[PDB]
Structure formats: C-alpha cells, structure tokens
Symmetry: none
Subunit: 168 residues, 2 copies
Amino acid sequence: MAQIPTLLYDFTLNGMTVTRDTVNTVVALEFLVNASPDLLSLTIGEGLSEETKFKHLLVKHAGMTRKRIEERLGRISRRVSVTVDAIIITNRKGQRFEFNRKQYLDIAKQAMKLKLPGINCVDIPTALAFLEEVLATALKDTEGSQDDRMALKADTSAAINHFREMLK
Amino acid sequence: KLYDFTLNGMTVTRDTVNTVVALEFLVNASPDLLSLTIGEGLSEETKFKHLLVKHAGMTRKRIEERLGRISRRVSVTVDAIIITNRKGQRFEFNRKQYLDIAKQAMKLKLPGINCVDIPTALAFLEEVLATALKDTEGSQDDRMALKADTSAAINHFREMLK
C-alpha cells in the first residue's frame, strides 16, 4: 500500500467553514467543469471516466499549499455552492452541475489512499497523476538553471522508460 | 571505491549526506514542492525528520547525484550546516543537534509515497504493478484494464518531458 503524502474544519467558503477534504473536492470539481477543454486535456488527458477525471484532479489539488488553495477558493467561490447533499458548480453560461457530496467524498478518500476497490493493486494511474504534479512543480523550481532542469528531465525520462519496458 | 562520500573536498558519512540533503531540500524546495512531498501541518523539526527518512531511502547512486548538484548551496562546519538559497540568504542548523534528530527520524515508517526523488517513486510503482500483474489468481480482465490504464498514464506523464 501507498498513499498521497499530504495526509477538522479550518477553511472558509462562502461564509461557512469546511474541511480541507471538502475544499479539495470542491476545487477539483470546479476545475473539471470550468477549465477549458484544452487545459483539461493537457492536465489529465483523454479517455478517462468522469470519476477517474475527478480522482486525478483531486490528488493534484490535494497537494496544494493552504495558501495556494485559499487563493483558488477565493477566485472560484462564487462559482460553487456546498449544500447538505450536493456540491454545485456553475459554468460560465449559468448552467449548474450537481455532484453528490457523499459519493465524491468517498471517491476522494479512495484516491487519497490510492485504493482500487476489488483490485489487489495500488491505483497506479492516480499515483502517476500525483507524480505529474511533483514533476511540474520541481521543473518550475529549476527554471533559472539549465543544468538542474536537464538533470531532472533526464533522470525522470530514464525512469519512465524503464517503466514502459516493464509493460511492453 | 570510496566507502564514504565527498562534499566540497570533505569526506562525509552517509549520515551527514542524508542530513545535508534533507536540510537543503527543506530550505530550497518551493513551498509548493514541500507540500506535495511531506504535506503541511508539521513542525520545523518534523519537516526535517520526514525529509530525512525519505532521502535516506534513496539509493547511493541517486543520493550521490543529488549531493553533487546541491554542493554549491551547502556548507558543513564544526558547529553548523549552512544552506544558501537562490537569493543568497543563509539558513543555519546546529550540526550535532540535527545529526541526532536524524537518528530518531530513521525510526519513522511513513505511509506516503516517497517522492523526494521522482525516479525512486516510479521504481516503487513499477515494482507494485509488476507484482499485481503476476498474481494471476484474481481477474484477468482486471489486470488487463489496469495494464492498459497504466500505459496510458505513462504516456501522459511522458508528454511532460518533451
């Protein structure tokens, strides 16, 4: 077993206090609905089920700092509504998309623990979705050093190719 | 071959390497990277403890590679380990105190995927999947879906490197 290394109510959203778990689910769903088709494709790729899209977006956002996810919450707070039973996302045209809170809080807990129900393996695609965020963040962190960026790409490329060969 | 390591002309043990490397990460990793790798809500000592045990799990080849790349940002003195950030600011840590904390950190068994080094994390996932794909008791349909989904995830990951 493995899990996302980033592990209540200490966040605020539309005048109400919420958990980090709720914030992560809200921000992931809002991105799912309102990111441009191009940004969504670049972020998670194509051919995923809606629940798997959420899982991969969730673990990327669950790694954000408090500071950065509070900045996100502020930017999108007016687009979201957390009710007793639902998380409701409004798109740029005013259409509302309802997501069952229970259902997505359970999906989120699966994803944070990299669990696949009924399958004896870590959720490898979700773990790789998280590692993509690690890579993207480490790459920005080198952008004033061509050497450090090259070493990071070369070392990661070697590892990802070794992992390709294992499946070939 | 040298049993210990060389840092800025000084012979240092793996214990010192692990502590230097973890402290350099703590100081110079972006807050975004730190959150991804160890989470938040940790005290300053606990941040180091988590970073220590994670870097201690890196192979010698990978840690010796890291050591070379950070050597220009670190200094080991009798009393202190000194980390310099990209702005020239110096952050100093009592060397004996943090070597002692490191011995305690070595006792931690953390559940998070260890991603202070991305190849290390990918090697863990590769091993875990190889095991699952070989235990043919369970569902062949499940295994073929997992293999297909993982290949697609690897292809999406690869795209970030071009």
